[PDB]
RNA sequence: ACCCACUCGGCACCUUACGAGAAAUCAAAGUCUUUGGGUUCUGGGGGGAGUAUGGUCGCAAGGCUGAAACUUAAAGGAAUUGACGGAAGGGCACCACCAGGAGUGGAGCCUGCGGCUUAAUUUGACUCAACACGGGGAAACUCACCAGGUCCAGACACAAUAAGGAUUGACAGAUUGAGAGCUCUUUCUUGAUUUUGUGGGUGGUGGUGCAUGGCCGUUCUUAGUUGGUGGAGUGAUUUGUCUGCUUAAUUGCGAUAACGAACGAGACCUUAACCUACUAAAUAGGGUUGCUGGCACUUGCCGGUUGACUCUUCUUAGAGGGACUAUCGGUUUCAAGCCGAUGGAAGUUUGAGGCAAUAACAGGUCUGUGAUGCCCUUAGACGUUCUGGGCCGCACGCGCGCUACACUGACGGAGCCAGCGAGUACAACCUUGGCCGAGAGGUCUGGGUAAUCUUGUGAAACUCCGUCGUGCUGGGGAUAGAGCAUUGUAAUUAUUGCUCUUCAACGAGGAAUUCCUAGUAAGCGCAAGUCAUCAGCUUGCGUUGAUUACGUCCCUGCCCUUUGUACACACC
């Protein structure tokens, strides 16, 4: 068989990068539990849309939300 | 040999066992163990001769076992009761004929 | 001089050995383990070597005499079955040749295989027995190759994270060939499935057919092969299994230390032929007869209708029968058989096949296999899966084929006849009939899971009358150019179908060499096979249908017999 040449690139996948987990919430003056980031209109509170620079995609819907806010 | 003996006991006209493959040493050979009658050619082959081919797997290579049995034509149940070439004639009966006319009457 | 009979001596010879001998053979090579008549000479595995040396005899060449070191597991003898022979005999075969036919090799083209070329142009096979073969007619798939990307289909075992997350998912654009989250921008999801290593595997159109199976091909579809007694040999062996004549045949008649047998051949089975004899039919065909269409017009002729009734010749297919070389005539040990009539559906094994022995081949397949050993490989995989390309490239060799080089034609009409087939409901099969289109094709409708519909597959070659009459001409059709269709996701590297145009090579093919003996050769289509689409290929099938042997070893190959052999890995 032919001599293996290979033209570079030994790529990999997204290994997740585990950040903080519960950073999309705030708890203040004893008992209160206030929400950070807009909750998903497709499926209610628990799943909250990712807020970027006019980019509003989901996780359970995986991608299906794009409208401006 | 044992197989052949068994076949004989079962009352078959002939047995032919071919064992093909590597039976000691790499260079392989088909050994042939036979007894009795056997036919080979013609339509009486599919009538009386029953065949079997099974390949045996061993950790150095494959064997192939080919077994033929020539069933007795007389013990047939359904189909022809002999080989087509076999012609056997019946025996005549004894005669003391002449002894001059006479008539049996009722 | 013969002739007969006897007799001593000689050169030999023939048959038997009851004796010898390893046997070939031997009246001595006998009277030898049942060993002694008298004597002379010579040998003690093969080489080294009739050499070295010393004598001696020779004019000389040489002779007589004659070692050893060292080397070596054999050298040899007689026979055996093979194999082979530029030995001698006898067979057989259109894969031999005659008598002929049809040709290929020449030409243009399809298409195999080289060689070259290439990122790759994937490989397997190279006399018959590789070369339109791998059912190999590749647009991707196939796919084994190449340029690139994607995925885990990394079992299970043991461990590091063990949820403050193991880890799955990811639109928008740059990313990328790319509505591949391939990822890098991201920060939303996912919940212990897993991932990171180490044991361990699994997949591989990876490798080896020289490790194998199975299948096949070939010796060989040739007539060959074997054992039980008996005979001959000390034995391997041999005879049976053969001088002849026969046959397609070790098929027989025969001859005979063999006799009777088995496998193969034959028998068989499938098919193709005949059946006014059965058994049958509105899924076959008829008859009369209803109604009915056209005729002459007398009753008569051709029709359309599953309207009645009946029939089975043709039809299909069940059960039978029938040919056994029958009858006769020749010819031959008056045998087996062969030849000629005659009758017959049938007289080449009645035609054609299917099956097909003993022994084999380092024949071909590990690219048919969840047939497979071992080796390689095993997450930048030789697993895969997408994407494009390649298998199809051309100075060139050869291998099957198609088309043709015309007047036995060509082109136009018109006439107008087949047999094998195949064919869908979960798909998209075969597809009449009606309209649209010069075509190709559309379209609407159908009929058919089929002796029912396609289909009477009204197929070609053909036959009838016409146009050109032998000029690379209206022979011939290659390249081309443009359009219109069709299949498919995709047609440039024309898939293919059609339309107009273009009109190339070739006036029957050298050295060679294939196939063939009767419904055969050859001509001509059709058909299934692959197939979404593509036929110059293939298994069948019909249609048209000859010429010439009815033989022989001259060539070629095979077989046997006799011989020779120092070969038996067998003349490479
Ligand atoms: Mg590489
Ligand atoms: Mg037989
Ligand atoms: Mg036979
Ligand atoms: Mg010696
Ligand atoms: Mg000798
Ligand atoms: Mg041959
Ligand atoms: Mg090819
Ligand atoms: Mg083809
Ligand atoms: Mg495989
Ligand atoms: Mg082999
Ligand atoms: Mg004997
Ligand atoms: Mg013999
Ligand atoms: Mg006669
Ligand atoms: Mg026959
Ligand atoms: Mg080989
Ligand atoms: Mg393999
Ligand atoms: Mg061929
Ligand atoms: Mg029909
Ligand atoms: Mg022209
Ligand atoms: Mg094609
Ligand atoms: Zn969501």
Q: Count of domains in chain B?
A: 1
**Cβ distance A15 to A23 under 8 Å?**
no
Residue B75 CA: distances (Å) to CA of B13, B49, B84, B103:
11, 13, 15, 48
DSSP-derived 3-state class of residue B53:
strand
CA distance A38 to B70: 87
Q: B58 CA to C13 C1', in Å? A: 74
Instruction: Give the DSSP letter of residue B102.
Output: -
CA distance A47 to A45: 5
Six-digit token string for A11: 């790529």
Task: Sort strands B31-36 and B14-20 into parallel, antiparallel or unpaired.
Answer: antiparallel
Task: Compute the distance between CA of residue A46 and CA of residue B80 in angstroms, rounded to an integer.
Answer: 85
Cα distance between residue A38 and residue A28, in whole Å: 19
Nucleotide nearest to A49 (CA to C1'): C188
Q: Residue B7 phi/psi, 5° resolution?
A: -60, -45
Structural domains of chain A, count? 1
Provide the CATH number for the domain around residue A56. Answer: 6.20.50.150
Token code pair at residue B68: 């033929």
CATH number, position B30? 3.30.1140.32
- Strand C reaches within 7 A of the A39 CB: no
Method: cryo-EM
By residue range, what is the domain housing residue B22? 1-106
Indicate the resolution in Å: 3.5
Q: Which domain holds residue A61?
A: 1-69
């Amino acid at each position: 068989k032919k001599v293996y040449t290979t033209p570079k690139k030994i790529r990999h996948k997204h290994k997740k990068v585990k950040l903080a987990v519960l950073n999309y919430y705030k708890v203040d003056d004893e008992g209160k539990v206030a929400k950070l980031r807009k909750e998903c209109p497709n499926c209610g509170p628990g799943i909250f849309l990712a807020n970027h620079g006019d980019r509003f995609y989901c996780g359970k819907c995986h991608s299906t939300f794009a409208t401006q806010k | 040999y044992g197989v052949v003996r068994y076949v004989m006991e079962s009352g078959a006209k002939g047995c032919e066992v071919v064992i093909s493959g590597k039976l000691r040493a790499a260079r392989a050979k088909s050994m042939k163990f036979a007894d009795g009658f056997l036919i080979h050619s013609g339509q009486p082959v599919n009538d009386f001769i029953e065949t079997a081919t099974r390949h045996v797997l061993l950790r150095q290579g494959v064997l192939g076992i080919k077994v033929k049995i020539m069933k007795d034509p007389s013990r047939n149940t359904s189909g022809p009761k002999a080989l087509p070439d076999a012609v056997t004639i019946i025996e005549p009966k004894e005669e003391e004929p002449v002894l001059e006319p006479s008539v049996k009457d009722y």
